[model samples]
Target: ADYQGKNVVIIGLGLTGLSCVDFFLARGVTPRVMDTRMTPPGLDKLPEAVERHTGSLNDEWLMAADLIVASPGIALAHPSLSAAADAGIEIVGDIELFCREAQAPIVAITGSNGKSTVTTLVGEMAKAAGVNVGVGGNIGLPALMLLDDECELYVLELSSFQLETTSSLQAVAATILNVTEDHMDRYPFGLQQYRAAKLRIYENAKVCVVNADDALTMPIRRCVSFGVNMGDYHLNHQQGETWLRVKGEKVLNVKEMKLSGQHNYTNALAALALADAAGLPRASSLKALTTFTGLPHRFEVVLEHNGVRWINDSKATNVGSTEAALNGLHVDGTLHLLLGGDGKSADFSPLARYLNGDNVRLYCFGRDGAQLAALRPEVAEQTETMEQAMRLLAPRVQPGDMVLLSPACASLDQFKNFEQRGNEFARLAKELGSH
Candidate 1:
């Protein structure tokens, strides 16, 4: 495992790949970076000293490599990767490398939904409790970017793809928020394979926090539990006020929180549960929950003009996430759901149930928009672009109506990412207000 002079072939020159380069170069290893795209993002950012390969991986380099550091986006089944495995070259991803070096306690979170919010919340809680914490992994910066000598704790928002190559992480606390069908295209075996990959985060975890609502998150091992309804940590109603509780003891009132929806409350429960596992104070956790509005593109209220609320939930890249957004924001007003983008071949059937509520309507846009429109045709409207959809949506949305952009599909078909798509929506909504 001597990194000195080792030839490391970095697969997929993305953020994680770039991070691997940083880590490898610091340890005296030489790295050859590769990506399928002729001009991948961050290609220009790479140092001129590093060897770069584009479009296709070099077989000779793969076979000669002392190690292969892969990006989560690349499938392990690639012919060159398979050949490298056959050749006995060590294969790993950025998280695997991070896990090997991260000596601090890690509160790792993974699920089809709500990981970013929970990860951020826990970091905030730790900070409020006067603990030095670093937050990132799949959520923000690469895992290695969060490493620091002064950091007391590391809260990582891990993805199934990242977890696939990670084996040595002994997290102080790990939780799978909830699971539903997502990234179907990535897992050939489908949901089962995806679920298995997510469950890998629990390996050697000192404390496992499961979502009592989702049976998929219920680990076989004894663990702490959290949910909106019931768990070791949960929400309770007393005299019509919603209160967050831990084992029957009241912790905080949901009304004191800035975040809206039952789903956000559920997320709050999860953050509290993990914070407790990490030994953060209850007061600090509650304080963070009340002050932290939410992350952008994840149920962020962009504008409220002419009595109509325009919410940007562009982070909802899967049906489950969109469904959670719907449940979290459901109210007496009409909800005009903007759903579409690259569907990833996920079953749009479950989303139909959410639309069963009389107050909801759908405006489908992008690649799979028409397909989702078919689910509730009577209450649905189809448009090819976000702009087109908004044009139709503007007039339909009245006072007491919420126009939410919670596309239940990936955003790459229309924009660079969900953030871009959300930014576009916010800009457009602001423009509409100007008119």
Candidate 2:
């Protein structure tokens, strides 16, 4: 797309917006950056020659823009954006721009959770097969950076926010792993609207991979189905080991796999199905799953001592993810589940039903501790902080019990991000066990 002398306005000076500026300027277009926050992160790193605007969105500049490249963090319903759309200015995202230029077989992944894992797994699978693949969209570097002459396949982990401004992603394969209530603040119209945005990945997809367990993930067309219990691709118990199977045919023993928990097994199946849909070799895909230990902060076991297992699942920032973790890890042993933080206004009542005397118990902390504790006062215990929760658990925890820090909410109320929160939990647990 020739953009010589074209006036482009980028909303938000985040990493995505900065990339847009670079892309526009490289094409000889006049680029202008606008952000609601005066000192937004990455603002200082922008090129000195680029025009900048801050402190509330500039509506006048937006109206005059030949095109608007919006950051995923920005809401589409913002007045300036809505008014720009009303005036017929083309609005797109970094991914949208990437899609237009990307000339490779794209495998797009999106959902409430597990997308990052699946995206990474697929990329690894491709790499294992001796294929040149570029992996990044929401996970690592911006999508535009992945474009090159060397890339044979492109695997993208797309978020709903990125999908909002993207419409022309012609993917070789696409999958919505699962969908649940999340980002409540962004989508006031609710889960249905968010689900719609996630579904956009299938718009121009050649092969649609659906999660059979989640009705929200089911595509209209006939596609590859993956699930934990039952599907075209699923898990089965054989003898004493869990097996990854395709229509009852054994693919590989999941027991030989490095990733623990049923959730990760399901993620493996989804990745396999996606890889298969994209015409990748089955042997290579299975090899990747067997070696992948899974990403950190998602049910990562930090330490085990005195027959008690400490898991750092700080990535469970939503009810659905926490629900998956509890069901995945709960075998015969009791669970001391720690939950709390920003809550994201999710209903904790569903989680309460999962708690049973034989398997699960709740330990609440951080900002929404009291609200979670109120969900089940008998089963849930409220603590002022994670350290306090650990201190309280020291005596009450028994041998063979699991101490899980799977906060079904964001960590902004207590820490900078989930990684920091998980690191802290791991550190505290390691110290706790030494005593």
Candidate 3:
């Protein structure tokens, strides 16, 4: 049969594809698998009944398929997929499938940074409000796993790549938290394409949640906004305690929250707006903010020794995020920023203004280490790797100083990913603190 009857195929056999395989199998649908990599994950888990094609995508089979479930990493720009899409073949992701069948409302989050933090906070808020919540997708678990009978709320962290394949996600609350120059290599048309991909989250959203502070996230459309002391949900000062207010009503005190950092504060505000848009109880939402310590690798503090602090913010993999981390430093001492890595073809010039301070110092390392070191040569040192940076800082740091690993580039040049780089930084900082 040249034209197969509604033949289904899943692309990529990584963690995403594995979950998709499990999802289809549970639904009593057997879909074929195709992975470009030679030895992709989850090969043993695949059943013998289902056929798979590894090493590359099968154009002949894929074009003939009535439906194609593409993994998040596989860009639709691929010639075969692009042609098939133009030919009217239905292309969907696990999120799209989950949305189509989901009984519970969704709070979708995407941004250059703080996506996982906000998504987790909303999930915690819903749980605190006594609603069974499922939090995953680009954070912990897969989106398809959240498609269940018992779950009441879904807080999903959608990446730009993930949003590309989804069209029917009518989220109760959706936000493009704040866009920045990220994934430049992936976007064929650069920032415009990347930003456009993120804007798709607003397409079928019931409530648009925008970051008023950032022009990239601001929309002409009606939206519930949050910003740094601005927007529908903003910070307020009363007597000495800074409070997060919603619609002029005081919600939670800033000091009461365990999470610091200006970025985390804005992230919390985003969570509040999303929760309110979803009709979640304000009491529980505020309660979640009081105890949430924030996600690791984003601005995680290792320890404070001799009044000098050490922070692991290796998740700042772009210029915008690193700038946020720099702005977040509210310490009473000289600061040292550990910056540099793969750079991802980003402009490092924006970092010059922040590092120009006499009290601020920088130790650059990795493939693009020289680029950052050149930002402020008077107060900067270039090294081969992060370990070398740490070694140089060991004796230079004083009692009233802070060493922060806020690399504004991807860690792939030195480590497997950002998490490992952060862990190594945390480990080194702990040892330095104990001395």
Candidate 4:
């Protein structure tokens, strides 16, 4: 829709929201921006063309808006959303707007986790094969900002919230990495509804990249499926295979890949499948894999001191992510793992397995630390309070040991969010290692 000189309103001034302001202002479309937080940190990044409407987005702004580009984080019950729905204004997101502008084949990706990795990888693969690719939504820039006069094929990441209002993105080739019991507190229908929301990415996709090993991402309609196992989808295994296969026989030759973990393999598999469907050659995908460094806070290496590596995997907010991070840490020395946070409903079976493996020296902390303490006697020597845990960990860590902070729950129990929690870990690691 040509929104030039229109009374557009972009809700939620996050990375996506600011990006929307950029898009509209650049196109000579002046949009008023609204956010619920009295003073969201991202609002400062907005353009001069954007009229700031801070505080809770209410009916007044909604009734005046001609077009609504709501950020993915805002819930349906959000005041702005409810008002926009009641008023019948055109409501969409940065991704939908981008797709409309591109007018070419687009690939959409969604999942509970790993969407960022897969999105970045796919963008690289497309660039490798000579296709003008733009990635947006949830990962890179907001989708709408990626639309230029010459861009083709938008690779978008669809969060469940973004999928709630979209349906007609048929030219898009969509893939879901894997779905799990996550973000349960955000959605109303629980895991089943959340799964359905993620599955929406494939509704109009000509090809579907699924996580074959993940039961939640296995089934879809009207597309060729790519994933880790064979059921509804072809497994993604070969660097040379045009079709998908399992990665069991030949592990990804990441002699150049910067990421670590089997989860990354799964992410790479999904990315490769998207490339294949896009008609991009495998060589481009492989080269991109070699160059991409991966996202921050996901097992990100903070520093290495005297052969001891300190890792910040603050994104592991559940038992699954923590276990995966643990399994992926195959360093030569001992792993001093720091875990705990706001408790989720995850079973401790996986965490227990990590303790059983004898691969780690555990230090549990955060509000859920006591609940995790039940697992402590198994490795009583490792468990301690947050401060005590780090101090205790300092003396025990040898030259080859890894100090890993991969909390398997939310951060609110002790801090504000994962980013804050990660910052604390980074601060503590720096301070403790100085001696």
Q: Lowest lDDT 10-mer window, candidate 4?
A: 242-251
- Tens digits of per-residue lDDT, candidate 4, 1-435, equal 687778888888877788777778778887888888898868767766567878788668788888887777677676657867887888887777766667667788887678878888888888877888778776667776677667667788778888876766764467777776766666657878878878777775677766657768855434455554553334343564433243333424644567755577667777877777877777777788778888788888787887888899887887777777866457677888787876655555567766755656778786667677677566544343456788888888788788988878888766757888788788888887766
**Candidate with the greatest TM-score versus the true structure:** 1
Backbone clashes in model 3, listed as residue pairs = none
Question: CA lDDT, every prediction?
Answer: 0.88, 0.87, 0.87, 0.73
Q: How much does candidate 2 score in TM-score?
A: 0.93
Off by over 4 Å in 1: 328-333, 357-360
Q: TM-score for every candidate vs. truth?
A: 0.96, 0.93, 0.92, 0.81
Give, for candidate 3, the lowest lDDT window spanning 10 residues. Answer: 1-10
Count the clashes in each prediction: 0, 0, 0, 3
Q: Return the top candidate by lDDT.
A: 1
Q: 315-398, model 3: which lDDT tens digit per residue?
A: 899999888887645767789889989987888888777775578888999999888888988888999989889988878888
Order of candidates by lDDT, top first? Answer: 1, 2, 3, 4
Q: Residue 54 in candidate 1 has what lDDT?
A: 91
Q: Candidate 3, residue 205: CA error in Å?
A: 1.5
Name model 4 segments beyond 4 Å from true: 4-7, 27-29, 47-50, 63-66, 83-89, 219-222, 227-260, 328-334, 341-350, 357-361, 365-389, 410-427
**TM-score between model 3 and native:** 0.92
Q: State each model's C-alpha RMSD to the native.
A: 1.6, 2.1, 2.8, 4.4
Q: What's model 1's TM-score?
A: 0.96
